[PDB]
Design a protein around this nucleic acid. Sequence first.
DNA 1: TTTATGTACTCGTAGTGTCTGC
DNA 2: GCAGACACTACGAGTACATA
Lengths: 257, 341, 257, 331, 330, 320
Amino acid sequence: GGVGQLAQFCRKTSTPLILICNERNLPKMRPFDRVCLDIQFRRPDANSIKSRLMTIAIREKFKLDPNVIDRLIQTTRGDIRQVINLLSTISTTTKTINHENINEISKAWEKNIALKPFDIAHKMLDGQIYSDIGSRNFTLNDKIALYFDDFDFTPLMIQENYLSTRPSVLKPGQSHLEAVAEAANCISLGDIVEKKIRSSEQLWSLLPLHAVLSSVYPASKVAGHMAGRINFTAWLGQNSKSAKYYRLLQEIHYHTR
Amino acid sequence: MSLWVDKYRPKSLNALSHNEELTNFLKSLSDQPRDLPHLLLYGPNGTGKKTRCMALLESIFGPGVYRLKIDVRQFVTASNRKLELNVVSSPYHLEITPSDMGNNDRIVIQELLKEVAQMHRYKCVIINEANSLTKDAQAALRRTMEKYSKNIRLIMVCDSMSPIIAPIKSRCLLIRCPAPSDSEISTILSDVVTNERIQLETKDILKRIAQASNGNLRVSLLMLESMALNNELALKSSSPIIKPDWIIVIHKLTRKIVKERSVNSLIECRAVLYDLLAHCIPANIILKELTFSLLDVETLNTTNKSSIIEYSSVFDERLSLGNKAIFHLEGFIAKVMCCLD
Amino acid sequence: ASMLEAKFEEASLFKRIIDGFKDCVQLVNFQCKEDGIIAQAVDDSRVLLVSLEIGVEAFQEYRCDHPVTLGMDLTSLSKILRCGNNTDTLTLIADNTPDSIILLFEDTKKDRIAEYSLKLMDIDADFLKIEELQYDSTLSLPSSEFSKIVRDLSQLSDSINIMITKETIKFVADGDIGSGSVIIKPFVDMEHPETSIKLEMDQPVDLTFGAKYLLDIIKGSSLSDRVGIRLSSEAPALFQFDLKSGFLQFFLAPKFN
Amino acid sequence: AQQPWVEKYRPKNLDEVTAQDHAVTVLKKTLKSANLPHMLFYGPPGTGKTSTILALTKELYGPDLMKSRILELNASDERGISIVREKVKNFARLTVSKPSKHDLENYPCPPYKIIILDEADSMTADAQSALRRTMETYSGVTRFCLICNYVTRIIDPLASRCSKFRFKALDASNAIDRLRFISEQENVKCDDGVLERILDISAGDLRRGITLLQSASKGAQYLGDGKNITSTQVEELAGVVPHDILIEIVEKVKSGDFDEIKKYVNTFMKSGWSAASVVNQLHEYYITNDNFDTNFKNQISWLLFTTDSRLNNGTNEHIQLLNLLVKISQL
Amino acid sequence: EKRSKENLPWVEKYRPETLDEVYGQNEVITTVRKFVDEGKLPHLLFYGPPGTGKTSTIVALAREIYGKNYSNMVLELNASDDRGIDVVRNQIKDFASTRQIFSKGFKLIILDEADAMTNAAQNALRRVIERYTKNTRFCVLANYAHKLTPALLSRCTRFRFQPLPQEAIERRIANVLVHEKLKLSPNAEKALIELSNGDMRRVLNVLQSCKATLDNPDEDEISDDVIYECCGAPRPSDLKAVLKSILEDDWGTAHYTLNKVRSAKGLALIDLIEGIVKILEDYELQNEETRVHLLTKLADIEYSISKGGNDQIQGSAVIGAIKASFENET
Amino acid sequence: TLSLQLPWVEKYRPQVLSDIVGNKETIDRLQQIAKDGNMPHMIISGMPGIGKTTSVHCLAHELLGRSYADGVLELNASDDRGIDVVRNQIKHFAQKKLHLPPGKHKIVILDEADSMTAGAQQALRRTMELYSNSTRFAFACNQSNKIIEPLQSRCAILRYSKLSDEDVLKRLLQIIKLEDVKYTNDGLEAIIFTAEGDMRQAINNLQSTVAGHGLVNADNVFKIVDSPHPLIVKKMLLASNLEDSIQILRTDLWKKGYSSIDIVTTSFRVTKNLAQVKESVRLEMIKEIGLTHMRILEGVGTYLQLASMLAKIHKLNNKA
DNA sequence: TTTATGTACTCGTAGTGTCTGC
DNA sequence: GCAGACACTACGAGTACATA
Ligand SMILES: Nc1ncnc2c1ncn2[C@@H]1O[C@H](COP(=O)(O)OP(=O)(O)OP(O)(O)=S)[C@@H](O)[C@H]1O
Ligand SMILES: Nc1ncnc2c1ncn2[C@@H]1O[C@H](COP(=O)(O)OP(=O)(O)OP(O)(O)=S)[C@@H](O)[C@H]1O
Ligand SMILES: Nc1ncnc2c1ncn2[C@@H]1O[C@H](COP(=O)(O)OP(=O)(O)OP(O)(O)=S)[C@@H](O)[C@H]1O
Ligand SMILES: Nc1ncnc2c1ncn2[C@@H]1O[C@H](COP(=O)(O)OP(=O)(O)O)[C@@H](O)[C@H]1O
Ligand SMILES: [Mg+2]
Ligand SMILES: [Mg+2]
Ligand SMILES: [Mg+2]
């Protein structure tokens, strides 16, 4: 009950008090919703970091090329501390940083950050990854790894917005409705796979199969730009309300019996 | 109570003016109850299987089976989740249903049947809605009735035969409960109304109720009571056949599917399905009603009807092996839209 | 009447003897003979070996014509000994190659009589002829002193290293908190003969042992006033606790390197 | 008469099992010896595996040693991995009980105890993997008898360690002596071919046949006419569709006309017969007919198999029956 | 154990007590003997089908290296024993870190059926193996390799135990018959070879049950006929007749023939499906569509039978599938 | 029981940074860190057996010398690295005052760091951020995905790649010249092919072949150690003739003693890692392989199921 | 957020034991 | 010596992961 004690401290404190976390959207900081003055920090603009690295490079004797800082911030995803660590490590043996080995360094130090469920649905439903050219770098193994980040929300996220897009990967002679039906078939198959996974048998080696049948194949036929925008899953709320309604139905069934 | 469905129920086999052959068979069983085997009554719902079970129970021991009480029993599962399920017990018998969560009704069956078997020689254990068991409690039952039988007996009531596994079919006697004939429905409704105080212009209303009920006497009695209450206790020959709001929703969904075959109409179909699943409805019956309402639309072709029924069979198989019914139902509607378009 | 009879003077003796090595051993293989009763049992890790032996003089009456192999379980044995008044006189009873033994918990000397029985356990492991050998050193220190030293040193490191060289006992235990270096000089006292640090010398030894196993050894210090430790570079450590008529060894296996 | 005829006439001797002659002779010759292997009984339900194992245990030890040297587990009992790891392992590693003078003199007591795991196909694979080396290590002191009706659920190592005894289905030829004996003992008036009909309807089991015979005898006792039980009463009580309704179904199927077959299927399901029985009747009518082409028979055989599998999955039988009839009608 | 031998099944009675008594795996046995004579013994990993002689080989190896009391010097853990990561952290660590208690030798750890260990247990076992490998060797017996962590696979020397060939089964059968004073006809021996499917326990069990089957254990010889009633497997002549009736004869004759064959001595549709599969694999088919249809339909039928169902409908399905598959070829 | 000779895997483990082959840039950077002394926090990741933890140990040995007994705290999965009983250990070790050379710091080798819980890494976050002047950390995990992003935000990412055939061959030839065993180039290339860039596997196969036949010729190598079954599975799935695929299946997997579930899992992995055929075709191949996988896991494991899987894979591959 | 076992981790609590003290 | 104080092991409830 640490978060509850911290919230109760926030209600009653006679000293200045601040908190530092990373993800407000987690439900465990939900009580902090209106007990604190929220200040949001974002990804800084590349100009200030560029100036700081110019000062650091001219102070630490190694040469730095201005066009390289943009790609370093882009690949590091706005992580200034990791940028400084990258500069130090590169300057250990190769003090000169040019535009030749920029792609080598960017690929070697690329950060495989986890992805949020809405962004997971957006990347899964993007029509470029299933194109011929787009599959050379983003192979289906990367799609499985992207699913496995959040394996509890991706099957629910794909199902609720795979029918609210313009499809961009339609086969010739195939309409949008046919693709929707053929995706729904494999979603139904993934339901059965999940039921075998989460049962008494408890076959958890079947997760990679469920990944394909519930996220990859259904989104490989309806890929495209959103008709509206990605909506949060509603099956959880509908299922909760249905469970409570079932409980109240059982109460009146037993009372009148 | 004021409801007519539970006000006029035949207590004895003598009052069972429904099936002469089935009543005679039950009386044959009740003639020598010293060696009565485990039973399994199957048939369409609303036939009156539970009425036969209670009538046989009071024919075995005597009057007093129909007095009932409620005894909530606390049951603990994995971790410390509490799913206390009450049992509708009574002297001389015990009534249980798998209304508990299906994934862990096996423990309810195991410890409750072991508790009742600690000792008029046997106590009958009626299991309503036995087709809803999850093939795990049935495994316990296989040896439960076989090992202890001189002290416990089961009257295993279910409206369908397919989910019941082979050994349970093997060790239980099978009793068949056909649905009433339309003439018998009209006769029962006429006896009810003449014992009641509702005025009828012509017995054609009873025949119309029999036709609309489709062999289901329970919903027939419910609809007759609703009509009598709505018609100021005087039925009219021009009274429209009132349907359950569920049937209205299914028919509106079928009309929306038939007329508009776009993705957006599928979105409203999904919303309607979400509402219906929130409205305490099993997946099998809703898919069956949707399929049979789709096949009753006259603008279809025989090829479209065959495709619809084949995909309905496929997706019903999928329902029998799935957890979230919404995906299977949405897939079935998508396939229907693809075929009709 | 029964072939094997062993009536203890008091249930307290057997309770203490069982509780001496109950924790460190799960399966015990008693071997009753006319010379006495022995029990060679091995730990689950197969590192610590216990060799119980009770002479015929510790029994008020004893008679066993045929050798009997009583393989048992110490958990259930201790559970059986847990119930029953400690002043009562226990009488072990067994048949000719039986499936169980009978624990006569005769209350006081009359009235209440108990018939607790424990099903015999099929342990086919033969007794191991590890009696003794030419040990390099033979020291003898009071049980309380050794228990206190081991308990103090176990909090400082996970390994206690026992070193003997030139008539001197030295315990060292280097760890994270610190490094104990408890040392003992041998002596003898006529005033209090119980406390006397006896010693013998053939070759210096530097053998290291685990902490938990040494704690398991010192849990049995309540049985004997004196404990005798014998070490060798090519032999397991021996901890001979002297009993009223027999003994209770503890063959501990040292670590290497 | 305090018990049903199923358990009242349950075999009490190994010779009383009037089927599975190979397994019974093997078990008897093993009873003479002591080399009892880890058994694995399998077959259709009602073939007599539990009866055989109980008779074998009773003849091995006797009524006194049932409670001491027999451990029987079910799916009703908890059979998690912890139970297999502790309870079964402890009972296996315990030494055998002490046979008395009476038991040793009268019965051929062997120096081992049998662990019977009824309906063992329901255990998780992890529990079976834990059971493997328990079975292997303590072979000299305990015997394992796995009684499952599905082999495929039992993992490969247990099927390798356990000697397999398939229990053959009990058709009309195999198990007619038992039914005749039961009729003689119970004084049940019977027709000539009534028992053959009973064994035909009871597909590969004798428990169902005994239950059907008991029901028919009870009905005849109620009527009290002293009349032999005809095939009609048994056929009606068995729940199989009469030939008139099946002929009507075939006539509706032959003409096509989806609306007519749909209406007749609705009425038929209102009358409420078991759809598996209807599929069986349709199979024994269509396949044995000689008025149909080869290609039609291929397609209808595949259709009947698919419908039977889908029904065995445990689905709504109305839709499956309608689909099967419509698919047959379009052939 | 009780009453020494002669009260055990033939599976556990004829367990090899020496590395010379292991047949079939000549290369593995010779390599292991060379290893232990030259004094080097790396972390061994024995992989193979059930019944091929993995645990027998490692038990014989531990008996050869140590004395008679090999169990006093080996920490042999199995799936029956609890093998959580706490067990690895305490029992395995203590056994590997300490010195031998009965003589001067290296500790040996045998982990039979180690595929059942959890991922975290294998992760701990990785560093446990790699740290204390100076005077402790780990042996891992695994039937399944996909359940083993690739780090664990990359650490132990892999030995593959192939299914037993014909000669090894023949030699073991000859030894068993010599011991048991039993006689067996060569055709029965060939039937046993075909019935084994690479398993040795199946051979020993069938020999035991067939000796029990005979009225007179001596004198009478075990023929393939006795093998086929005792095991219950279909005879090859029955399979050939059924397949011929299906291929050439019409539905009435084929259905009657299959029913008669099944009801003659209680055959099951299973073992008959893959008997037919073997016979059809012994054919040459011009069109790949025949092979595709046969494989798919027979796999579906075998799956349905594994789930259970009506045997008559499944037999009709088998006949229909075969007859429909052998008409697309022309 | 004679004392066993140390295996060649551990006997010839490198003790200096020069002997590690492969990833020349990473090794040179580690050497420059070694002589420079300013070791930063780093996380080392890669496939198993390519020299991850040995580089960590060699760098720890080189940076600080006689202080190696107490100046480095090594932790692993065998130690119960939890949130509570272990935060105090690193807290004390980092707070421990030990006098080093001016450019050297204490090293905390959290070996096998991908197995730690989330809370342990959350505590390690501020533990690393506070005492960055005194102690430095060294994570060595097979997979870097388990490490949370705050830990990745303050660490130097050193990604090792699978060893090239030339470097493995070079170090193998070094081992042969130190051991003087007769070798043939065909046998060496067979060892390289079997190892698949896994160095410890190469050394173990070399050990087995040397001590089993004396000569490491290709025939002896293939006799002792089998070719990797992923390659056989990939060959089987890519064949054009169904009869050829069935024959490869039977002869190379069913008669070689491979479980059906192993074949199915390897086929799934090969299909998901395959790139020659069209993406959609791989999708239906994965779906069918998964259906066969469900059939195998439900209990029915038979040659017929694998044959049906291959038949349907050929149905999809040949485009009806 | 339902899932549905088995595993592992973490914390909290309740006693149980020996250790100081008057 | 009895009483309190003390820190220890043992136990129970809760959460989170499950393929690379
Ligand atoms: N061969 C047989 N001879 C005589 N009676 C038999 C035979 N097989 C079955 N029965 C009868 O079947 C009933 C009990 O059979 P069981 O042994 O319980 O069948 P089963 O093997 O248990 O089937 P399960 O357990 O549902 S798979 C008794 O009424 C027996 O008389
Ligand atoms: N090569 C062989 N030579 C002789 N007997 C063998 C051979 N392989 C197996 N056996 C016999 O098979 C019996 C059981 O096989 P085991 O080797 O003990 O177990 P396993 O072969 O390792 O199978 P798993 O994987 O442990 S279930 C042994 O007792 C032997 O009698
Ligand atoms: N580049 C290399 N140069 C020389 N030997 C190497 C090299 N890479 C690995 N080895 C050998 O591999 C063995 C130990 O490798 P490790 O580094 O311990 O494996 P690893 O990189 O830690 O992989 P994991 O994840 O721990 S299984 C020793 O015998 C080393 O000699
Ligand atoms: N012989 C009969 N005469 C009149 N009503 C009957 C008869 N049998 C059954 N019913 C009616 O059936 C209703 C009970 O049906 P029920 O047993 O609940 O069906 P189900 O078992 O299918 O749910 C009662 O309201 C009763 O009026
Ligand atoms: Mg049974
Ligand atoms: Mg083994
Ligand atoms: Mg490593």
